[PDB]
Design a protein around this nucleic acid. Sequence first.
DNA 1: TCGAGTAAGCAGTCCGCG
DNA 2: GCGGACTGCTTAC
Length: 901
Amino acid sequence: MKEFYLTVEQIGDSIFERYIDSNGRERTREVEYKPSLFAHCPESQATKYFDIYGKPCTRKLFANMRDASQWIKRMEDIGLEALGMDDFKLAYLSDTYNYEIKYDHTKIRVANFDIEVTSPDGFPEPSQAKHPIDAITHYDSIDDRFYVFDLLNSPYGNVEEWSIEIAAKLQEQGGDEVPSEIIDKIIYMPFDNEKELLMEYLNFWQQKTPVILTGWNVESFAIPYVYNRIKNIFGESTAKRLSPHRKTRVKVIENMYGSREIITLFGISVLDYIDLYKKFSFTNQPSYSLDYISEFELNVGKLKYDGPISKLRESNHQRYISYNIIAVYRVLQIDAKRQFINLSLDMGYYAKIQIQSVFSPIKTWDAIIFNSLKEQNKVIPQGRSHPVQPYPGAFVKEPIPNRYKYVMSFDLTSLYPSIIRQVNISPETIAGTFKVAPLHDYINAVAERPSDVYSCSPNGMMYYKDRDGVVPTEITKVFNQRKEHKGYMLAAQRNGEIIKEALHNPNLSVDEPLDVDYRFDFSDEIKEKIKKLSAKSLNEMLFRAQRTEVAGMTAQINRKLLINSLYGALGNVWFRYYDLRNATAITTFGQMALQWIERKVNEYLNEVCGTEGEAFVLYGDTDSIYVSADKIIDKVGESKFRDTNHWVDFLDKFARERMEPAIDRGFREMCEYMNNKQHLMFMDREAIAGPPLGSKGIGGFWTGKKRYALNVWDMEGTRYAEPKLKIMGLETQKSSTPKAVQKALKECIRRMLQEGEESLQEYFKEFEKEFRQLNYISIASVSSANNIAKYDVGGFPGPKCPFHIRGILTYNRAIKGNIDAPQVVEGEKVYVLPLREGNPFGDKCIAWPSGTEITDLIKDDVLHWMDYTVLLEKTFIKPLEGFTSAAKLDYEKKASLFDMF
DNA sequence: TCGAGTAAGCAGTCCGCG
DNA sequence: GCGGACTGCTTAC
Ligand SMILES: O=c1ccn([C@H]2C[C@H](O)[C@@H](COP(=O)(O)NP(=O)(O)OP(=O)(O)O)O2)c(=O)[nH]1
Ligand SMILES: [Ca+2]
Ligand SMILES: [Ca+2]
Ligand SMILES: [Ca+2]
Ligand SMILES: [Ca+2]
Ligand SMILES: [Ca+2]
């Protein structure tokens, strides 16, 4: 078995490494690693080492890591570049694992934990840790066991042992419904006192030391709480046993508004699942409580209990412990679906970094590029300081606000990475500059050809064509990986639609789901068997197909994120290869590419229609164009189509056989114009959209840039069983829009696009009539809440106080004096409701922590005084008015001459 | 919100606009 | 009442 690292740290002049040896055993070692760094040397001196620009370097081998660090400092004192990898543990990993790492996840100890702390006087601050830890559940991936540490005796109450038999039974039996599949995996340990609990936990931790440590808010709460509580009870040395090297650091995390403290445990890789979720999920959620996210991801019900959490252990210890266990399991269930741990491991081992560095694309790419260069005996440049400077981005076309009946969209494959590769954009491939014409002149192909020697971008930059830069070389590798996983994702998606179709005609039989790989398009044999299956089996297959789609989505979209972040890093001052010339080369080329192909598509369609000067491209943003297909449909005549699927087939074939070849020709000419290294502008059909055949639906509409809705029948080769709304930017897509209002606005849009004006009118009339019955949470707005203190002047709104902050200040006055009441936390999200004039809260709105019921003391008053009229006008009527005016229709029936009959 | 980038939309404050 | 200048927040890419 090939060896692989688990964790690596630098502690003074030593590297401390945990690793899996060639026999599959976990080991630890301390290595007196002697790092090398580099200085430029005379061309006369014979070396094998060259910088990225081809300048020769001499290697300097240091007696230890502190000597190397001191040398860097002195080189700055002299004013000379100190070249090489200054993060010595990355150099250590590069030397020690000089091959593509194959890791075995079954040997990696992944721990998932959660603690409970009863607190009568508000939130238990981890820096203080003044309250007993009364429960820990710690799941270990190697053992596949939930270890439960339960405090029976506390100053806040003495309790009886938790019962696994009660835990297992249904809620209807008085049980806790702990999932049957984990019941046999629970190892329950009760304790007579907190000191014994914590000592045993540390002994357990020593035996089963996490490599990856995760859970929900573990970095901000659980870890600092446990560390500080042990520190308070036993002293520092004992608390440091949470580190396998007995080293910890209090780390100050800073933002624009303030700072917070976390505990760095040397030799452990903390991947807090909340942070993995925020980075890798591509959602923006109204709440990030585990109950909220679990309900969203898994469709599990919120865990119900009577009274406040501060009294739960005393009143119902049985439920208290069961809920602690379930909380740990829910994170495991979310990871089973989303697979963010798998992603982090893949990425981390690929780059040869500490696994926790997957949060930083700058660190990830620094390591990838370093390792790549090192293989050629090339030497990385020193990082330099740069002032933050703005630079230009993508082009977005201003659409004419209107309905658009038939629409075909086209999109460039992985645009910015493709530009990097096509143009050959890299720190070491810069060849020089040329005199720039206005962008318009390049778009229309009237400007002089930039170069007959080098590969060009319309920002004035020229690049070598003789060899690929390291940035193109390395970005291509990850792009190719992304392509494979996107293939699996789309196959799974297409497979899901086959099952959805079959579910229209389920067979009356007792069946089992088919044992199949959803990552590959179903064979004819599989399709024939699916048509014979029961609804139970089909639904189970659909669930499995959709789970496979999600797995593929995680793998593909986050590889996309990584490569797009390499582009972004070029425009971040902390990146070793920061260069606004290269960042701007990419974006400016993109602006040209979009507008160039806009022209070419307009030219092609005008030719085939026999018309002159009309605009077929109605919209474009960054790398995509939207083409009006009305005239193409009208050339055949709607009466000649059998059904909706018939004109969809026709447009699909037209896009693939006619437009794509023309688009390809257009881009090949642009490549020659810019003298680029390799043609990689691949623009393929994305969406086919329109109303159902024979209906009064409008098909689609735009209100402005980044704000549109389309009724889509086929998306990237997936032919839907039922049409899918593609809605971008509109209020249905915003986390700030109330839940029930998103739902209502979506139905309004559906009716507009699929059914027409009259259908829209009847739904509006009903919503307006009934909406006051909707649950208050479902009609509350949502907002992040920053700078509460800034706008707080004696408990009242200061100058220019934002609406949501005003609401928080109102809440704060209403709960004043109560240490029990939930506090609004700076930087988190709040629900917001408007209040009718003359209300007892003394202001026009109130806000409270999102994902929660408002506290009982003020709930009745909030409900009594909620301003339904303002709520409706602001969240529903205003956006709907926007949609309908753009689409040129009315949400309320206009008076007619027929009324007088 | 510690963690790659820019474009650009809407809500709301403040206050001009005879 | 609406718009511009501005802050705040959130989305598309
Ligand atoms: O998070 C992002 C998204 C997009 N972009 C830029 C780069 C990207 O190539 C371009 C187009 O984004 P898309 O969302 O269309 N995806 P892309 O073309 O990169 O990939 P895909 O192949 O999926 O379309 O906009 C970013 O820089 N960061
Ligand atoms: Ca694209
Ligand atoms: Ca694409
Ligand atoms: Ca059937
Ligand atoms: Ca796109
Ligand atoms: Ca193609």
